[PDB]
C-alpha cells in the first residue's frame, strides 16, 4: 500500500512518507542533498538523499538509473545498502523525484584519522572491513573508482561501510584529497583500467592510517606522479608497453629512472606484516597488485580473516552501461526499479 506523504521545505520541498520524522539537513552526497531522519518503522537513524534533477538530461537520467541499480544490488555489512527508495508520484506520468534511504553513519574516516596515527590493531580492523567490502563489490565486477577516507563511514564500534561506489577536471586540480588516493593509471589515463585501481587507493588509505599523513599529497598531477615514482620506482619496460596512451608513455620515458624505496625505511616502526601488505598493494603495474580476496588471506589480518564469512555478490547485470536510450526510457527503467523495491529483512 502507498504510505501517506507529508511536505517540508529543506535544502527545495521534500515529500516523504510519515514514517520518516525529524528530517534535518546533513549536507551533500553524490548527485543530491542528504537529510538525517528517524525511521519510526524500523527505529533506525537514516540518511535520506533526494536527487537533484534526476531526469534533466540523458546523462543525469542514466546516472540516476545507475545509482539506483548499484544501491539495490549491494547487500553486504561493509557496503552502503538501500533501506528504502520512494517517490510521491502515483504513476510514471507524474514521476519526477527519487529519494534514497540508507543507514545514518556517525563519522567518515577523515574524522577518525584527524592528523593522528591509529594503533596497529585499529588499522588491521579498518582495512580488513574495507577489503571485505571490496571483495564483495569486485566479485560483482563493480569498481569503486574513487575510494578515499571521506567515502568510508564508521559507527561508534568502528564498524565500517563503503559509500559512493560505481568528479570534474577542476575538482581534481591541485592540492586536493580528491586526487591523492587515485591510482596513477587512472589519474593520467594510461590505459583501460580495472578493479585493482581500488587496491591502490586502499594502500594509500592504509599508509595514512599508519602514519597519520597523506601518502602522496601532490600539489598537482605531475607532482603527485613524482611522489608516487619516488616510492615505488619508475616503470619498467614491461609496464611501459601496457601504457596504451602513446603520449603518456612518452612523458613517462622522459623521467630519470628511480629504484623502488625500502618500505621498512619509509614506514619506520610499523608492523612488518603491514609493510609487506603495503608493498603488495602499492605496485605500479596494476596486473601485479594483490587483489581484495588475496589481501584478506594475508597474515596481517590473521585475527579477522574468515574465508567462510567473506561473501561474494550475486551477478550484477550492467549491460545498460553500453546502452543508448532516451530520457523517458531511462526514466521508465528507473520507475520500474523504484516500484519493484523490496525492503531488507
Ligand atoms: C554523506 N552521506 C551520503 O552522501 C549518503 O548518501 C546516501 C547514499 C545512499 C542512500 F540510499 C542514501 C544516502 F543519503 C549517506 C550518508 C549516511 N550517513 C552519513 N553520515 C556522515 C555523518 C554526517 O552527519 C558520516 C559519513 O560521511 N553520511 C552520508
From Swiss-Prot:
Q: What is the effect of changing residue 320 to L?
A: Emulation of the active state. Increase in activity
**GO terms, biological process:** 3'-UTR-mediated mRNA stabilization; angiogenesis; apoptotic process; bone development; cartilage condensation; cell morphogenesis; cell surface receptor protein serine/threonine kinase signaling pathway; cell surface receptor signaling pathway
Entry EC number(s): 2.7.11.24
Instruction: Using the record's annotations, give every residue carrying the modification Phosphothreonine.
Output: 12, 173, 256
Give start-end ranges for motif TXY.
173-175
Among InterPro entries, the record links this protein to: Kinase-like_dom_sf, MAP_kinase, MAP_kinase_CS, MAPK14, MAPK_p38-like, Prot_kinase_dom, Protein_kinase_ATP_BS
Per UniProt, the keywords (alphabetical) are: Acetylation, Apoptosis, ATP-binding, Cytoplasm, Kinase, Nucleotide-binding, Nucleus, Phosphoprotein, Serine/threonine-protein kinase, Stress response, Transcription, Transcription regulation, Transferase, Ubl conjugation
Does the keyword field hold Glycoprotein?
no
| GO CC aspect terms | cytoplasm; cytosol; extracellular region; ficolin-1-rich granule lumen; glutamatergic synapse; mitochondrion; nuclear speck; nucleoplasm
User: Which residues hold ATP?
Assistant: 26-34, 49
* Family per similarity comment: Belongs to the protein kinase superfamily. CMGC Ser/Thr protein kinase family. MAP kinase subfamily.
State the protein's purpose: Serine/threonine kinase which acts as an essential component of the MAP kinase signal transduction pathway. MAPK14 is one of the four p38 MAPKs which play an important role in the cascades of cellular responses evoked by extracellular stimuli such as pro-inflammatory cytokines or physical stress leading to direct activation of transcription factors. Accordingly, p38 MAPKs phosphorylate a broad range of proteins and it has been estimated that they may have approximately 200 to 300 substrates each. (Microbial infection) Activated by phosphorylation by M.tuberculosis EsxA in T-cells leading to inhibition of IFN-gamma production; phosphorylation is apparent within 15 minutes and is inhibited by kinase-specific inhibitors SB203580 and siRNA.
Subunit arrangement? Component of a signaling complex containing at least AKAP13, PKN1, MAPK14, ZAK and MAP2K3. Within this complex, AKAP13 interacts directly with PKN1, which in turn recruits MAPK14, MAP2K3 and ZAK. Binds to a kinase interaction motif within the protein tyrosine phosphatase, PTPRR. This interaction retains MAPK14 in the cytoplasm and prevents nuclear accumulation. Interacts with SPAG9 and GADD45A. Interacts with CDC25B, CDC25C, DUSP1, DUSP10, DUSP16, NP60, SUPT20H and TAB1. Interacts with casein kinase II subunits CSNK2A1 and CSNK2B. Interacts with PPM1D.
- What protein is this chain from? Mitogen-activated protein kinase 14
Lineage runs: Eukaryota, Metazoa, Chordata, Craniata, Vertebrata
Amino acid at each position: 500500500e502507498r504510505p501517506t506523504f507529508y511536505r517540508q521545505e529543506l535544502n527545495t520541498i521534500w515529500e516523504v512518507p510519515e514514517r520518516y520524522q525529524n528530517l534535518s539537513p546533513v549536507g551533500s552526497g553524490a548527485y543530491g542533498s542528504v537529510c538525517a531522519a528517524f525511521d519510526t518503522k524500523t527505529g533506525l537513524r537514516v540518511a535520506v538523499k533526494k536527487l537533484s534533477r534526476p531526469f534533466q538530461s540523458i546523462i543525469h537520467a542514466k546516472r540516476t538509473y545507475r545509482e539506483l541499480r548499484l544501491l539495490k544490488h549491494m547487500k553486504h555489512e561493509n557496503v552502503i545498502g538501500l533501506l528504502d527508495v520512494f517517490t510521491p508520484a502515483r504513476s510514471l506520468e507524474e514521476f519526477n523525484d527519487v529519494y534514497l534511504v540508507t543507514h545514518l553513519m556517525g563519522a567518515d574516516l577523515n574524522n577518525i584519522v584527524k592528523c593522528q596515527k591509529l594503533t596497529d590493531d585499529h588499522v588491521q580492523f579498518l582495512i580488513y572491513q574495507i577489503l571485505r567490502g571490496l571483495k564483495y563489490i569486485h566479485s560483482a565486477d563493480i569498481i569503486h573508482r574513487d575510494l578515499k577516507p571521506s567515502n568510508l563511514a564508521v559507527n561508534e564500534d568502528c564498524e565500517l561501510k563503503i559509500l559512493d561506489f560505481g568528479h570534474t577536471d577542476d575538482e581534481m586540480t591541485g592540492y586536493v584529497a580528491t586526487r591523492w588516493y587515485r591510482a596513477p593509471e587512472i589519474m593520467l589515463n594510461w590505459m583501460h583500467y580495472n578493479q585493482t585501481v581500488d587496491i591502490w587507493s586502499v594502500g594509500c588509505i592504509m599508509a595514512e592510517l599508519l602514519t597519520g599523513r597523506t601518502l602522496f599529497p601532490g600539489t598537482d598531477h605531475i607532482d603527485q606522479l613524482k611522489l608516487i615514482l619516488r616510492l615505488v620506482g619508475t616503470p619498467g619496460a614491461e609496464l611501459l608497453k601496457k601504457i596504451s596512451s602513446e603520449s603518456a608513455r612518452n612523458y613517462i620515458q622522459s623521467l630519470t629512472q628511480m629504484p623502488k624505496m625500502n618500505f621498512a625505511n619509509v614506514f619506520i616502526g610499523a608492523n612488518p606484516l603491514a609493510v609487506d601488505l603495503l608493498e603488495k598493494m602499492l605496485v605500479l603495474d596494476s596486473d601485479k597488485r594483490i587483489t581484495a580476496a588475496q589481501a584478506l588471506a594475508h597474515a596481517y589480518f590473521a585475527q579477522y580473516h574468515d574465508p567462510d564469512d567473506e561473501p561474494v555478490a550475486d551477478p550484477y547485470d550492467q549491460s545498460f552501461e553500453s546502452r543508448d536510450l532516451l530520457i523517458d526510457e531511462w526514466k521508465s527503467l528507473t520507475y520500474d526499479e523504484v516500484i519493484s523495491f523490496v525492503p531488507p529483512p
